[PDB]
Amino acid sequence: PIVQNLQGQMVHQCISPRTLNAWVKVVEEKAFSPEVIPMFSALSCGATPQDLNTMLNTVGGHQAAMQMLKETINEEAAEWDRLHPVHAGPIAPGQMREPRGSDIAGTTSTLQEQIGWMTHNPPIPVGEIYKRWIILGLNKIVRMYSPTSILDIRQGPKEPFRDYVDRFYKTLRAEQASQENAATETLLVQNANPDCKTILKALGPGATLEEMMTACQGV
Amino acid sequence: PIVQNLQGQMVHQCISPRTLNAWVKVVEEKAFSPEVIPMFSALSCGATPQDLNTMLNTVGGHQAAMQMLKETINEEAAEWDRLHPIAPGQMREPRGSDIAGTTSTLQEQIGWMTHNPPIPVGEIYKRWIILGLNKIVRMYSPTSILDIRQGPKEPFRDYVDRFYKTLRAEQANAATETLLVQNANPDCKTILKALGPGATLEEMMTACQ
Amino acid sequence: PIVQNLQGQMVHQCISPRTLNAWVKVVEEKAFSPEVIPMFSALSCGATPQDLNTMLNTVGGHQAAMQMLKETINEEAAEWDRLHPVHAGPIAPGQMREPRGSDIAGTTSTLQEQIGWMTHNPPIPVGEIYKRWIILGLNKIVRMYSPTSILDIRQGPKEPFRDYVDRFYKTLRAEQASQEVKNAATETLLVQNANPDCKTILKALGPGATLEEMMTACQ
Amino acid sequence: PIVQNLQGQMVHQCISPRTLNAWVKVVEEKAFSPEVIPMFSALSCGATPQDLNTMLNTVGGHQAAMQMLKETINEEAAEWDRLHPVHAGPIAPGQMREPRGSDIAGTTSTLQEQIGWMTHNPPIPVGEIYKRWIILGLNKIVRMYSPTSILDIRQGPKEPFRDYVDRFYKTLRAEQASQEVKNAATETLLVQNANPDCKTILKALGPGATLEEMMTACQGV
Amino acid sequence: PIVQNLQGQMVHQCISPRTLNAWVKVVEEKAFSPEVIPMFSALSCGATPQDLNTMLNTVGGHQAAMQMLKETINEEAAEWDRLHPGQMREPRGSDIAGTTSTLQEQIGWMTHNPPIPVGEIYKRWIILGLNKIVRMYSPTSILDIRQGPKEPFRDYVDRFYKTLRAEQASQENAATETLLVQNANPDCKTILKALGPGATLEEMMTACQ
Amino acid sequence: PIVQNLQGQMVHQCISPRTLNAWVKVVEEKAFSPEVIPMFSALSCGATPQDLNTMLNTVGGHQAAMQMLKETINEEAAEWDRLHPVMREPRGSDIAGTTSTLQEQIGWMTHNPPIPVGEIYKRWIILGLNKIVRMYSPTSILDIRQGPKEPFRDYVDRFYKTLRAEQASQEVKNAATETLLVQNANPDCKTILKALGPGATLEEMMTACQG
Ligand SMILES: O=P(O)(O)O[C@H]1[C@H](OP(=O)(O)O)[C@@H](OP(=O)(O)O)[C@H](OP(=O)(O)O)[C@@H](OP(=O)(O)O)[C@H]1OP(=O)(O)O
Ligand SMILES: O=P(O)(O)O[C@H]1[C@H](OP(=O)(O)O)[C@@H](OP(=O)(O)O)[C@H](OP(=O)(O)O)[C@@H](OP(=O)(O)O)[C@H]1OP(=O)(O)O
């Protein structure tokens, strides 16, 4: 990554073995659960395109997801090339060549060029752009790899309400690739067992989740 | 987080993998026991709203508690917007979603936190998060304090352990402790009542040994 | 904690996750064995009252011991307030206010104030004072939670002398006897409670035998 | 490795035990799967030829692959010597002798000479050149140790399409030591080797479908 | 410990949790095998008497050995007081052992010009006591190490020099070579005597391969 | 070890617990396999004689090998004293850290020009470890024969692993090793290898015998 030292310099630093092993183990253990996407975004803090490619390429399995991710990266790179055409001619002294789509993705750019863009005045954050594309692709992968539909989450006859809500919002987070309505509240209240459904319907509209789980604690 | 370097400057630093793994494992292993809230407050030392959202979002399970936490954060953000509705260099004040890192960038968060005077959006957001976590800890407590009664052959030390564990869970005030003397078995209750008021817990546990 | 940087300044540093995990695991694994108190004193090196409260509050179990520790801390704070009365007289124009009992315990003081007292010239080491109180309370807890009395430590018929002396001095360390009481109780109880073989051998060594000679003769 | 410190100096640093153990365990657990090569490239960040030789020599097994790697390194060194004949003359003042093939491989060069080449202005990245050669040899080893041909990857009757594509691009990555492998023949072989149901759906999607659309259309079949 | 930072200054540093855990686990796993003494000497690099007392006091078991070590430290302190009955004050025996000296005084002696290494002296005493403990905790006598009928010579020499290192509290003579050749099984004994006197261990183990 | 700080100075640094534990675990797990010697050379990077003695003395087992190593170190020190008759000049035992202090070792290693007592001692230690590795080698290269159904890759693995063990080195390939390699292969792979002809690289040999 590119981090700031003690002398106030933006310098390049080798990616640590702890970060590599952490990302590899996160992918091995959690597959493409939603919480993988924050973790990735946290483990690639200040990363260069080379570091991002390193994190993605060290994954051994999930090659379908990785190939999808390459297709998404190519789409976003083509859009970047359409919106930011690199002008021909020679580069002025003291200036950097403008990055193509593959330059942001670390395919046709060197590490020295990536450091140059990221530490230039004004900076071109190629690492953050590439990370944005990668996070788009990973959102697609998370939505695709979601196992269960939200319509199939129904509270058991003797299942506690807390576990039912856990499965509900876990499934919803998996299918939306996001933790961010009225249809969700109605689907939530509708799929409860008769007791909790009667209590929740008795609570009236406009109720919060804390009140809902408090009213069904032990029912 | 935003930390002070060995040269005296307040700079931004990437959140360490050990802190992330430590928080994730704390949530996975301890669920929402009370001691999770201090640990969190220690692992988010000097954290920005982005770092707080990172710590909360890396949690895989307990999505009911996390959604409750989002509701609490939205409530506190709406309250902030209600309590905080032109100079040349008048810096913009943070909205509710700006403190929560929803509508603010890392550059803006560092801007508020390092301004003169500073607006510690990280500490405010951490205050809201700790409120929500207090609610979650209070709800996830298994037993009520009124249901903590000393067994016929239960040692007094274990009974006090369960008593103050449950009490700590439900109080995420001082008159509740009176229940400790009331819910003891007849022997220990008679001895403790004989000790009178002003008796410390050490004397109580010694008298019932 | 408060540590020294490169330019010789005493600055505040966030408590590391390794120290937190080390303290939590020490409490979980060793309960309130005596060696926990030195370990604590080592893990809280240079700690502020906030850091000490963090270390105490991260303990999940032993809430009876933690409440006892809170009572002891309140006692020592009240004694501090008794020994340092707030004087009603002429204060110097640059006279900094002295910390109260609750200020040293981190209850009514902020982190900036704690750093202020600890880094002042001359310093008021509120962290070391609070750590002294906490170590007093932990001493009480260790003394109370000691399972066996020293009078009940008797060498087994086939128990090796090394294991018997190990249990003897472990129990003695747990009960915390003064050097005179530990020397008398050690001289009479140690030799007296040995099995007939080791007792005969030890008696054959003559008076004034050191523990090394006693354990060598019974090997 | 040669890294930059807090004061912006390029200094030599002893290779860390964590990097050594990480590389050794990666070789022990993953053998010569493709993902080993990126990992290597990450663990040898800023490495000198001496550090590269250290990482390669700490490998205990796979001595056939290691000896092959020595042959590849010697070939690339001979090619370097063919492309850069050092002039039989005296070294200019304030300069360094140009590195031969064995100098880049750390065989006939000292650590101080490697630091000299790597920290000179302009630098001669002997570590990056040697790493390029090593990555060539490791690419050969990965392609050779690939167990299955891409032609033998056929979707099972009840195998999910996601697992079939996983095995497909995993095998293809192993056989090419690369992930930029998706062309026309791979897309047609991919659609062709699917089970009748998924093959009918994929052909019904039409030409030019993305992999996301292909796996979405065959989800739950 | 007192270590040198990146700016060439000798400063005091808090003992790291990794060193504490390393020492505690070394004592728990290896007990008082000889190799514990070098490890200790490595983990107490640059340590003050306070740090040494910290390392010794964190040991939970082996309280007999710890009391022995305390007695040995008191003996060496009494000997130091016997040898030492703008002039800086000299440290007494209890000052070197960290009993009657503060951390400020220890740093004062250790960082003076010329330095008075109270930490290295205390470490010398502690290593003496630990040598005593290692010699006592040795399980087997060297005279009882005899090569088995089908035991390889390499394993026999391993046990031989492990036991010898345990009873010497050091691995650094001729009676050991004669006892070694004497304690071999008949085959290896005939081969070793056929090698002749003055044979090195490499030749002895090579001849029995 | 002696490492470089921010002011460009060579200063002494306490040996880390992770390096000690790494070396101890390497000895416990790998015994005296050849790859231990590079690992050692990497874990003692910039080490002082005191640090080298620390790494060697923390080994709990293999006391026969450690005593052999002590004998080799004493031989190399006596030879150093014979070749260099007498800051004070270092003796053989001074380089081995026996009769020298840490301050003296730092003095020699940080002098201009430096006297690398750590690198000399490390050379001696690596000599002794080479002896130990060659002795602890289990099998002779002449006993490595390809099984009837053993893949050629595994046979070459055992071949060059055994050869590396018997020479304490990887630079071992020559004409005798190539002819012994082709000779000890099973009839099928031997026929294919003979069909390749001379000058065939190991890559071509392993490709021709695949499957
Ligand atoms: O006190 P800590 O926060 O736990 O700092 C440690 C310490 O780093 P510094 O002393 O440089 O701050 C370790 O250094 P050692 O002395 O053990 O070598 C280092 O380990 P490395 O040697 O592997 O650099 C480790 O870093 P890592 O996280 O990469 O394990 C890092 O811990 P933090 O990174 O968590 O601060
Ligand atoms: O001495 P230990 O308490 O057993 O500490 C180890 C050690 O961690 P540290 O050296 O950072 O304290 C391992 O680190 P390695 O050098 O083996 O890498 C680490 O393993 P990881 O590398 O996987 O982090 C492991 O952690 P884990 O529990 O996740 O296996 C952790 O053990 P504890 O966590 O029990 O302290």
Give the ligand 2 atom nearest the CA of E22.
1
Phi then psi for residue B162, to 5 deg, are: -65, -35
Atom of ligand 2 nearest to the CA of C21: 36
Q: Hey, is the C-beta of A33 within 8 angstroms of any chain B C-beta?
A: yes
Would the CB atoms of E202 and F63 count as touching at under 8 Å? no
Same domain flag for E136 and E96: yes
Query: Token pair for residue B140?
Result: 């996830």
Residue of D7, D57, D68 with shortest CB distance to F6? D7
CB-based contact F64 E35, cutoff 8 Å = no
CB contact under 8 A, C30 and E61: no
Count other Cβ atoms within 10 Å, centred on residue C144: 17
* Torsion angle defined by CA atoms of residues E179, E183, E184 and E190, in that order, rounded to the nearest 10 degrees: 60
HSE, CB side, 13 Å, CA atoms: give it for residue F170.
26
Cα(B105)–Cα(B102) distance, integer angstroms: 8
- Count of A-B CB contacts under 8 Å: 82
Q: Could B8 and C12 be called an inter-chain contact, meaning their C-beta atoms sit closer than 8 Å?
A: no
* CATH number of the domain bearing residue B41: 1.10.375.10
Ligand positioned closest to the Cα atom of D25: 2
Q: In the 8-state DSSP scheme, what is residue D194?
A: S
Pocket of ligand 2 contains residue E206 by CB under 6 Å: no
How far apart are the C-alpha atoms of D128 and D41, rounded to whole Å? Answer: 10
Q: Does D165 contact chain A (CB < 8 Å)?
A: yes
Burial class for A41, CB neighbours closer than 10 Å (0-12, 13-18, 19+): buried
* Co-location of A111 and A165 in the same domain: no
| Radius of gyration for chain C, computed over Cα atoms and rounded to the nearest angstrom | 23
Last residue of a domain, one of D149, D168, D186: D149
Residue D46 corresponds to which tokens in the numbers above?
């800023």
Cα of D19 from ligand 1 centre, angstroms: 13
Q: Tell me how far apart the alpha carbons of residues D20 and F41 are, in angstroms, rounded to a whole number.
A: 12
Distance CA C199, CA D90 (A): 87
Structural domain harbouring C20? 1-149
Residue nearest atom 6 in ligand 2 by C-alpha distance? E18
Are A117 and A123 in contact by the 8 Å Cβ rule? The answer is yes
| Tokens at D127, concatenated | 């570590």
Residue type at A58 in one-letter notation:
T
Measured over the CA atoms of residue A205, residue A210, residue A211 and residue A215, the dihedral's sign is positive
Chain A's closest residue to B139, CA to CA, is A214
Q: Give the pocket of ligand 1 (CB within 6 Å).
A: A 16, 18; B 16, 18; C 16, 18; D 16, 18; F 16, 18
């007292």: which residue's tokens? C117
**Residue D72 half-sphere exposure, CB side, CA atoms within 13 Å?**
20
What does the alpha-carbon distance between residue B149 and residue B145 come to, in Å, rounded to a whole number?
9
Q: How far is the CA of B17 from the centre of ligand 2 (A)?
A: 13
| E4–F7 C-beta distance less than 8 A | no
Q: Considering every ligand atom, which ligand is closest to the CA of D19?
A: 1
Within an 8 Å CB–CB cutoff, is residue F67 touching chain E? Answer: yes
Residue D160 token pair: 């999910």
Domain total in chain D: 2
CA–CA distances in Å: residue F26 to residues E171, E177, F18, F19, F23 = 21, 30, 12, 10, 5
Q: How far is the CA of E14 from the centre of ligand 1 (A)?
A: 14
D40 and D124 inside one domain? yes
**Ligand 2 centre distance from Cα of residue E59 (Å):** 21
Cis peptide before A122 (omega within 30 of 0): yes
Residue D15 Cα, gap to closest chain A Cα (Å):
12
**A26 touches B at CB < 8 Å:** no
List alpha helices for A15-98, DSSP H: 17-30, 36-43, 49-57, 63-83
Other residues' Cβ atoms within 10 Å of the Cβ of residue B80: 18
Tokens of F100: 């020298």
Q: C141 and C155, same structural domain?
A: no
CB D100 within 8 A of CB D80: yes
Q: What are phi and psi of B11, to 5 degrees?
A: -125, 160
User: Which residues from chain C sit within 8 angstroms of residue E7, using beta carbons?
Assistant: 6
H helices of chain F, in order, are 17-30, 36-43, 49-57, 63-83, 92-95, 102-109, 117-135, 152-167, 175-183, 187-196, 202-208
Instruction: Single out the residue of D212, D134, D145 nearest to residue D176, CA to CA.
Output: D145
Which of the listed residues A149, A170, A200 is the one where a domain comes to its end?
A: A149
E141, E165, E189 - which closes a domain: E141
Angle at B3 between CA B2 and CA B4, to 5 degrees: 140
Name the residue facing B38 among C17, C57, C61 (closest C-beta): C57
C3–E18 CB contact, under 8 Å: no
Query: CA D20 from chain center: how many Å?
Result: 18
- Cα–chain center distance at F208: 33
- Nearest alpha-carbon partner for C70 in C124, C141, C15: C141
Task: Assign residue F145 the CATH number of its domain.
Answer: 1.10.1200.30
Q: How was this structure determined?
A: X-ray
Q: Tokens representing F79?
A: 């030879």
Find all residues with CB under 8 Å of A130, minimum gap 6, and list them: A49, A52, A73, A104, A105, A106
Q: Are residues F12 and F103 in the same domain?
A: yes
Three-state SS at C101: helix
Q: DSSP for C129-190, please give it.
A: HHHHHHHHHHHHHHHHS--S-GGG----SS--HHHHHHHHHHHHHHHT--HHHHHHHHHHHH
Shortest distance, CA F64 to any CA of chain E (angstroms) = 5
Across the interface, whether the CB atoms of A144 and D35 are under 8 A apart is answered no
- Residue found by looking up tokens 């004087």 in the block: C87
Query: What single-letter DSSP state applies at residue A92?
Result: P
From the CA of A15, which ligand is nearest? 1
Give chain B positions within 8 Å (CB) of C18.
18
Contacts of F62 in chain E (CB under 8 A): 158
Chain E's closest residue to C167, CA to CA, is E63
Chain F: give the shortest CA distance to residue E131, in Å: 14
Cα–Cα distance for residue pair A13/B13, rounded to 1 Å: 13
Classify residue F105 by burial, with Cβ atoms within 10 Å: 0-12, 13-18, 19+. Answer: buried
Residue numbers followed by a gap, chain E, C–N over 2.5 Å? 85, 172
What's chain D's Rg over C-alpha atoms?
23
Pair E68, E2 in one domain: yes
Give the single-character DSSP code of D44: T
Helix ranges, D5-62 (H): 17-30, 36-43, 49-57
Token pair listed for B25: 């494992």
Phi, psi of D148, deg, nearest 5: -115, 145
D168 vs A: CB within 8 A: yes
Please give the Cα distance from F53 to F119 (Å, whole number). Answer: 13
Contact (Cβ atoms closer than 8 angstroms) between residue D21 and residue F26: no
Taking CA–CA distances from D172, the nearest residue in chain A reads A63
Ligand lying nearest the CA atom of residue F25 = 2
Token pair of D88 as six digits: 């039989």
**Considering only CA atoms, which of A176, A144, A167, A164 is closest in space to residue A217?**
A164
Regarding whether B38 and B78 lie in a shared domain, the answer is yes
Residue C36 to residue C142: CA distance in whole angstroms: 9
Distance CA D171, CA D155 (A): 13
Asked if residue C110 and residue C207 are part of one domain, the reply reads no
Amino acid C217 reads A
- Of all helices (H) and strands (E), which one includes residue F2? strand F2-4
Nearest CA in chain A to D40: A58
CA E51 / ligand 2 centre spacing (Å): 24
- Within an 8 Å CB–CB cutoff, is residue D112 touching chain F? no
Calpha distance C10→B201 (Å, rounded): 39
Nearest to A6 among B5, B70, B135 (CB): B5
CB spacing of A165 vs B7 below 8 angstroms: no
For the CA atoms of D44, D45, D51, D57, the dihedral, rounded to the nearest 10 degrees, stands at 0
Rounded Cα distance between A113 and A103, Å, is: 9
**Cβ contact E123:E44 at 8 Å:** yes
Examine the domain organization and report whether D105 and D174 are in the same domain. Answer: no
Same domain, A141 and A165: no
Cβ within 8 Å, pair A41-B20:
no
Q: Where are the alpha helices (DSSP H) in chain C?
A: 17-30, 36-43, 49-57, 63-83, 101-104, 111-119, 126-144, 161-175, 179-192, 196-204, 211-217
- Helix-, strand-, coil-residue percentages of chain B, each rounded to 5: 60, 5, 40
Residues 6+ away with beta carbon under 8 Å from D193: D153, D154, D155, D164, D168
E21 lines ligand 2 (CB under 6 A): yes
> How far apart, in whole angstroms, are the C-alpha atoms of residue A75 and residue F110?
57
Helix (H) or strand (E) holding D3: strand D2-4
Distance CA A141, CA A176 (A): 11
Report the neighbours of B using a cutoff of 3 or more CB pairs below 8 angstroms.
A, C
Closest Cα to residue D214, out of D187, D196, D189?
Answer: D187
DSSP F110-131: TSSS---HHHHHHHHHHHHHHH
The C-alpha atoms of residue F81 and residue F70 are separated, in whole angstroms, by 16
Please confirm whether the linkage preceding C122 is cis (ω < 30° from 0).
yes
Q: Are residues D193 and D155 in contact, defined by beta-carbon separation less than 8 angstroms?
A: yes
* Cα F2 from Cα C10, distance rounded (Å): 27
Nearest to A149 by CA among A170, A120, A130: A170
DSSP, collapsed to helix, strand or coil, labels residue E170 as coil
The alpha helices in B115-200, defined as continuous H runs, are: 121-139, 156-170, 178-182, 186-195
Dist. CA D26 → ligand 2 center (Å): 17
Collapsing DSSP states into helix, strand and coil, what is residue B37?
helix
Secondary structure (DSSP) of A159-186: --HHHHHHHHHHHHHHHHTS---HHHHH
CA–CA gap between residue B182 and residue C64 (Å, rounded) = 17
> Is beta strand F10-12 parallel, antiparallel or unpaired with respect to F2-4?
antiparallel
Residue D116 and residue D149: Cα distance in Å, rounded? 46
Q: Please spell the DSSP secondary structure of B76-108, one letter per residue.
A: HHHHHHHH----TT-PPPP-HHHHTTSS--HHH
Q: Is C1 touching E (CB cutoff 8 A)?
A: yes
Nearest to D40 by CA among F154, A58, F60: A58
Cα–Cα distance between C40 and C46 in angstroms, integer?
Answer: 12
**Same domain, yes or no: D181 and D142:** no
F67 chain-E contacts, CB cut-off 8 A = 157, 161, 171, 201
Local structure of residue E190 (DSSP, 8 states):
H
Tell me how far apart the alpha carbons of residues C48 and C130 are, in angstroms, rounded to a whole number. Answer: 9
Q: Is D45 helix (H, G, I), strand (E, B) or coil?
A: coil
Minimal C-alpha gap between F78 and chain D (Å): 28
Q: Are strands B10-12 and B2-4 parallel, antiparallel or unpaired?
A: antiparallel
- Asked if C61 lies within 8 A of B202 by C-beta distance, the reply is no
- Let me know the angle formed at the C-alpha of E48 by E111 and C5, rounded to the nearest 5 degrees: 65
- Show the CA angle centred on residue B177, arms to residues B174 and B179, nearest 5°: 135
User: Is F102 in the E-facing interface, judged by CB distances under 8 Å?
Assistant: no
Contacts of F156 in chain D (CB under 8 A): 63-64, 67
Interface contact flag, F160 D70, Cβ < 8 Å: no
Distance of CA E192 to the CA centre of its chain: 33
Cross-strand pairs, C11: C3
For ligand 2, whether the C-beta of E140 sits within 6 Å is: no
Cβ pair A105, A50 in contact under 8 A: no
Contact A114, A48 (CB under 8 A): yes
CA distance D101 to D73: 9
User: Does residue F91 belong to the interface with chain E, where contact is any CB pair within 8 Å?
Assistant: no
Closest CA to D5 of E45, E10, F9: F9
For residue B115, count CB atoms less than 10 angstroms from its CB and return exposed for 0-12, middle for 13-18, buried for 19 or more: exposed
Q: Are B46 and C6 inside 8 Å of each other by CB?
A: no
Residues A179 and A111 in one domain: no
